């Protein structure tokens, strides 16, 4: 393999354009050289216009497959076929951000899925969220302008922290159930993998014998739902702004494929309107106690794409693309989201986009349409119309698979308006927030209080505190105190308290009790013991965790017994906002050094106060301590194993302190055990609940 | 004013799409719908590509005017004019990163002058640093590849800190020039306003007699250059991401215009070849002290943009704009820059480019260039060619103003190549990294530990280590130990220890002793002392600086005295990387309160990290000296005003403790002098050199 122009020209040299010159003078570039200007023309027209929203995206190749038939609500194979298996590729991405802005910042999260049937490709284009700020897509500009950076000054970036998406939240109270999400820990989701997602809008499955049922589909996470805390999605998206791209490339490069259970809501045709909400409002989710989701299929993601612009960048989804047994329904949402996928495509990438590896089909495509900019396809014949002489591409019946429009009843008048039940705006925003757990309550309290104190105008986060009393009345106390203005004493939206399943992250836990993909940082210095290292070194890579080491240095550090490591990272160059949890081994000389060092006490004030595990062996049991300085936060004083608030130590280790079986469960014997135990439940939300992590700087 | 189509018909709403409905049943939108489909198509569509390098950026209006006139170097009016004004727009950003990327990443800056002279556009592409990576356009593609995000993984994003940029840092010797300027705080400035700017490429000059001279052009800030430390640079990415576009924005509102004196080295035709390095190669610069600065004019910004979109983003700059009296040179790299500007345009814009409002000149425009995309211009007329009948649109003579073409001498052979000087590639990096003042290095260092850090693979730095040894042995030795490696003992490319003039940033310091602009955050809580409060806040606000109170809410704090006040913002929602320093007034429940809160304690404790200028009066003062707990650090214990290490504190508050005279200068007798001192001194960098930011954790 040799340096060619895009012609098939071997070049010589890549460092130099043709001159004129001389040994010792050097002259003019020649406009001759096609080489050099063919370089620069490929470089200088190397990008293309990002996604009007979603532009900062990940996304991965896997496969989708049903365990079991749906047959009995769709005759589409995909969802019937328990034999075959689907390939998928996946995109995940933010909403209001440009293409270079963070992974972690506050925003609804966007989780496409491509899937290239043997039948067409059917795009299931969903959010990490079941509900959204509007009914009718024609505002779609409106709520998306409302929320990006201001037209004047183009600020603020990739946030809804700022007047005009408040303003906008107030003013449309269509709105009012998405931006009680949009506060919740939904939207700063720990990992791609662990946050579920939503078709959002009501589709139709037709089945063999032509019955149709309204449905909503759903992703659920085997990893379980869990988010970060805001202090810390802050800090990461600045000290990796691809926190999320790398956690979703890694883990599947280690082998920790990702999967989602599939599920299905239906309703059938004849109970359309049964419900106190309109099932085709998008602003309503279907309460899962009185619609159940029937899971039916699993999808993985296996395979990280082999190069990022051809691939994740080009891909385009649309909610048009779907294959027969599966359709659309008067959703007023997805109505006009329709005609948006296929129309941006056109200066986003082209008109022939759906040539591109990425985009096309896995099955043939057979058609009239021709021509158009970029065009690879070359297509023999005389004829490009039907009906033709040759019968050529004729019409497929629905016998052979041709795509079963339902002869839905239609009646009315042609106007700019929306049924009667799309007028309820406030009862389902209550019951998520009556439904939240009360740490879910205060991360939604301290994500309002945050937003509005970004809101310079008093007449912005004035008005959104008047309207926090349409939720909840003493939320809009909390909140006016925090922020400014004033709460109301009354309301004429009460909230009468009831609440419903499947909407706390407390109710999407992990499969199994599990450590799987975490990252655990492991904190030594010169003279740590290497017999704790050891221990929980192999344990945490033998539950699948990952294992960082990280160091006064990175060049060598020293055990007490006088082996050595290298460390991942030193101190300065990691921070604990990077991993789940901290363990810091033994060892008298290393616990000293450590005790002095501003970094490393910073490491385990900022873990402790990020709500993250904490495990400490030894003399490091005292560097901890003392490290939080907290009478609230007990540790270990003998041999014995001790848990407080997520800090698990052990003081004096003895010859059966790394003997014990490593049990990831509540009240384990070992000291592993209780330490991964922590790590598995994510985040010790008590230490949070009782205001520890405000007595503590970081 | 009233909503309408882009056609001019007015609509009755901006809420619903023209659908079938009934009072109880919503029906399938309609097709027909032209308001709704214009709607979501211009939404569709709004975005273009951003530019390849240099994506992220913010500009701004403003004037130039030359208080010298320079017509015995060239004859181009627009610096030979002293009595008039020529209007600019300028446009600063970052390199590598995407659109949505941070402001304060560590990165080259780009400083783009368009100059609207009455003959026509002249652009000045520089960027904040003087030299380049490397020496001919051709290999822009490389550098940029390589620092770039890898193209299997999207990965990192605006950030040199990866594998492949060190891989090409070392493999292509005549980047280590640049490199060392890339790990300096250049890269890291505090503001766009306190930055140097710079042509890099050596232009020409051409005065009335036909006479050439080979020149450097420099921007000089009035506020001197200043910049942010590591630790506090990666928060703000996250935490503020539009920090540097807001810093100008805010300070041009505020009637706060920056400004920067224009200067100019100049090199007679006959000398060209009278140096050790090649005057043409972009790798080098002219020491000062052998050729010096010629200061002749000034520029200030003085409006922000009316929409950012077709201006800001839409604006093009290129090196192929030159005004008669103003040329180019042979530099390689140059040459090459001339062929990109133009390119790039017409995919990023269009071929009508220069139609666009931003980009066209004041002056008129008369040739026959015609059609393209989106054509706005309609000339009459029957003759679009010269020569031509009618001798319509005749060619300028030189007296007429033609552009002036140098008849230089040319003589060689086609290849590719350059010449004898251009082979010298490590000199300079030695002399720049000679002429770093002691905390400069000291920042330089844990740069490049950083930096080599975040490299996975031992080649890249195992290199790197390998390749400092060719700028400074104990450089070298010190990265080695940091990130691993093994320092040779020895080098080909021994480093002599000269040093040069107006490297360090130490020989900028502002133009006088000021405090204009910067942002001092006040910190209260209820009980607080309102007579410091408000001789400090009027102190700031007469001192053009501007006072952010910050308190534990953002509704209400009352003071000691029962008097009020609404903070800008409360504790949580804001930090103090966003401002340049703090002051705390008195009041015992106050400090009380403030002492058992976390994060106020992180206020103090990094606002002391990051180096900034801590002022503290009564009983702040225990609270300070107790949040830092440094014995190196002391303050007041009775009413005489001290300072140590930039923290400047007043315990016993007196009747005259705020009538001293407000001087800013070294050695101040009063409080707010010698508090503000500190702040005019930017950061205390004694407090780094002794290693006490080391021994608090933040
Ligand atoms: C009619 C306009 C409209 C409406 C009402 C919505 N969207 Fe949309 N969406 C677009 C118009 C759009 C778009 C402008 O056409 C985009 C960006 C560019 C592109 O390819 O598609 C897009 C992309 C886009 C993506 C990114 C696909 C990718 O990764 O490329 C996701 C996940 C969604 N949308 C999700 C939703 C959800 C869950 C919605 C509410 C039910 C929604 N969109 C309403
Ligand atoms: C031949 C290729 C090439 C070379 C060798 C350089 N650049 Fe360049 N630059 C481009 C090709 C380019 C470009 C690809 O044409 C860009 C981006 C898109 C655009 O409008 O111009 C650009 C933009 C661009 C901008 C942004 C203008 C704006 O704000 O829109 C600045 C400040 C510079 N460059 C500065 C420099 C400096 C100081 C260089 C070294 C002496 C340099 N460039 C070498």
């Not at 899925?113 to 990490?128: A, I, M, P, Q, R």
Request: glycine share 8%.
């Amino acid at each position: 393999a040799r340096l060619t122009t895009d012609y098939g020209v071997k070049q010589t040299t890549a460092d130099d354009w043709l001159r004129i010159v001389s040994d010792d003078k050097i002259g003019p570039s020649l406009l001759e050289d096609p080489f050099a200007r063919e370089r620069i023309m490929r470089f200088d027209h190397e990008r293309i216009p990002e996604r009007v929203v979603h532009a900062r995206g990940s996304g991965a190749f896997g496969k989708f497959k049903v365990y079991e038939s749906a047959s009995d609500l769709t005759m589409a194979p995909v969802l019937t076929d328990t034999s075959r298996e689907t390939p998928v590729f996946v995109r995940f991405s933010t909403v209001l951000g440009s293409r270079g802005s963070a992974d972690t910042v506050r925003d609804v999260r966007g989780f496409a899925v491509k899937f290239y049937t043997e039948e067409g490709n059917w795009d299931l284009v969903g959010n990490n969220i079941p509900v959204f700020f509007i009914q009718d897509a024609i505002k779609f500009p409106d709520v998306i302008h409302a929320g990006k950076p201001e037209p004047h000054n183009e600020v603020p970036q990739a946030q809804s922290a700022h007047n005009n998406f408040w303003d906008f939240q107030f003013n449309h109270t269509e709105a009012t159930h998405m931006f009680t999400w949009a506060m919740s820990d939904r939207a700063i989701p720990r990992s791609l993998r662990m946050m579920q997602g939503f078709g959002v809008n009501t589709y139709t499955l037709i089945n063999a014998q032509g019955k149709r049922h309204f449905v909503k589909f759903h992703w659920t996470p085997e990893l379980g739902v869990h988010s970060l805390v805001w202090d810390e999605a802050l800090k990461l998206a600045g000290q990796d702004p691809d926190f999320h791209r790398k956690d979703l490339w890694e883990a599947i490069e280690n082998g920790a494929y990702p999967k989602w259970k599939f599920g299905i809501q239906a309703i059938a045709e004849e109970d359309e309107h049964k419900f106190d909400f309109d099932i085709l409002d998008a602003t309503k989710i279907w309460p899962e106690d009185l619609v159940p989701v029937r899971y039916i299929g699993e999808m993985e993601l296996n395979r990280n794409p082999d190069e990022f612009f051809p691939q994740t960048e080009q891909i385009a989804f649309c909610t048009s693309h779907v294959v027969n047994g599966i359709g659309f329904s008067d959703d007023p949402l997805l109505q006009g989201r329709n005609f948006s996928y296929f129309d941006t495509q056109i200066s986003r990438l082209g008109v022939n986009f759906q040539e591109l590896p990425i985009n096309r089909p896995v099955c043939p495509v057979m058609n009239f349409n021709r021509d158009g900019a970029m065009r690879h396809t070359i297509s023999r014949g005389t004829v490009n119309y039907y009906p033709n002489r040759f019968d050529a591409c004729p019409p497929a019946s629905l016998k052979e698979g041709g795509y079963l429009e339902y002869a839905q009843k239609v009646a009315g008048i042609k106007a700019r308006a929306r049924s009667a039940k799309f007028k309820e705006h406030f009862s389902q925003a209550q019951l998520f927030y009556n439904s939240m757990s009360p740490i879910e309550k205060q991360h939604m309290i301290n994500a309002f209080g945050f937003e509005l104190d970004h809101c310079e105008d008093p007449v912005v986060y004035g008005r959104m505190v008047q309207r926090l009393a349409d939720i909840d009345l003493g939320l809009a106390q909390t909140i006016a105190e925090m922020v400014g203005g004033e709460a109301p004493t009354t309301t004429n939206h009460p909230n009468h308290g009831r609440k419903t399943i499947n909407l706390s992250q407390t109710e999407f836990p992990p499969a199994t009790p599990t450590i799987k993909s975490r990252r655990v940082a492991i904190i030594i210095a010169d003279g740590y013991d290497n017999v704790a290292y050891d221990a929980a070194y192999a344990a945490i890579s033998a539950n699948q965790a990952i294992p960082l080491v990280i160091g006064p240095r990175r060049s060598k550090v020293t055990a007490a017994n006088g082996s050595t490591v290298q460390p991942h990272h030193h101190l300065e160059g990691f921070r604990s906002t990077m991993v789940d949890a901290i363990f810091i081994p033994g060892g008298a000389k290393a616990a000293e050094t450590l005790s002095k060092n501003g970094r490393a006490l910073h490491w385990i004030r900022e873990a402790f106060g990020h709500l993250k595990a904490i495990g400490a062996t030894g003399e490091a049991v005292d560097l901890v301590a003392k490290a939080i300085a907290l009478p609230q936060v007990t540790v270990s004083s003998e041999a014995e194993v001790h848990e407080s608030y997520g800090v698990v130590t052990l003081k004096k280790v003895k010859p059966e302190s790394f003997t014990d079986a490593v049990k990831i469960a509540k009240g384990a014997a070992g000291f592993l055990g209780e330490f991964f135990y922590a790590i598995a439940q994510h985040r010790n939300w008590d230490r949070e609940l009782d205001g520890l992590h405000s007595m503590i700087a970081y």
